[PDB]
Amino acid sequence: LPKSVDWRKKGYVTPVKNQKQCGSAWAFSATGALEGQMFRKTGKLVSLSEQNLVDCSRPQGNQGCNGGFMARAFQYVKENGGLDSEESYPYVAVDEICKYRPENSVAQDTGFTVVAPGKEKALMKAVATVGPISVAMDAGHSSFQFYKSGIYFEPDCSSKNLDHGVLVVGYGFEGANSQNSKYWLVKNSWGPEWGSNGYVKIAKDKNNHCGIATAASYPNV
Amino acid sequence: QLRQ
Ligand SMILES: [Cl-]
Ligand SMILES: [Cl-]
Structure with missing residues (x-):
């Protein structure tokens, strides 16, 4: 596999969004992954609707x-036959009436693929060969709230009790040795003001840190 | 999870 991958440099990732005071990270993770797969399939990057998923x-x-x-x-996008654009079904950060409109659908999927649980090398392969991957993590820490730079590593992190959905857009390493000081490139949904322009480097190949490879998946388009 |  490549020594480093960054799907942001290939046009697969939309700018950082903000879930605000709504427990909808799972929806931003899902739209981010669908955004990268629709980009691979068609060459067009279109922001998808988190609100459509929430409602x-x-x-x-x-x-x-x-x-x-x-x-x-x-599963919903598959069962439903589509998913509307962010432009047509805007985010308001509160639970509302389902207003899904097929005529505004710009994405579809036939189901999804699961990355073998707990396997960081399997996630590495999915990231390198597929595009951005949805993952769950343990983000319940002040150290994560105030993250700013560097490889995030938190001793209190759980690899099994997770509470936040995010998007792995790549992986890399610091220094000239590709085999150490590794990290996952993760897109968060807390605004571009949080972290490093909305992103965080999470320690990679450090025993599935914060659970990044425990519950990883991607839509099949 | 949310931003606190
Ligand atoms: Cl959430
Ligand atoms: Cl999931």
Whole structure:
């Protein structure tokens, strides 16, 4: 596999968004992954609607602003036959009436692929060969809230009890040795003001730090 | 998770 990957440099990733006070990170993770797969399929980068997921995927087991899961979101897009654009179905950070319109759909998926649980090398392969990958992490730490630079490594992080959905857009390393000081490039949904322009480098190949490879998946388009 |  490549020594480093950054799908942002290839046009697969939209600018950083902000979930604000709504437990909808699972939806931004899911739209980010679908955004990269639709880009690979068609060459057009189109921002997708998180609000469409929040308001309409309760049947699949999501709970809108009270939490959800990316795989359930990809299941909804499949069962539903489509997903509207951010432009047509804007984000308001509160649970609202499902207003899904097929005529505004700009994405579709046939289901999703799961990355073998807990396997960082399997996630590395999915990232290198597919595009941005949705992942769950343990983000419940002041150190993550105030992250700014460097490889994030938090001793209190759990690899099994997770509470936040994010997007792995690549991986890399510091220095000239590609085999050490490795990290996952992660897109967050806390605004570009949080972290490093909305992103964070999470320690990679350090025993599945913060659970990045515990519940990783991507939509099939 | 949310920004606190
Ligand atoms: Cl959330
Ligand atoms: Cl999931």
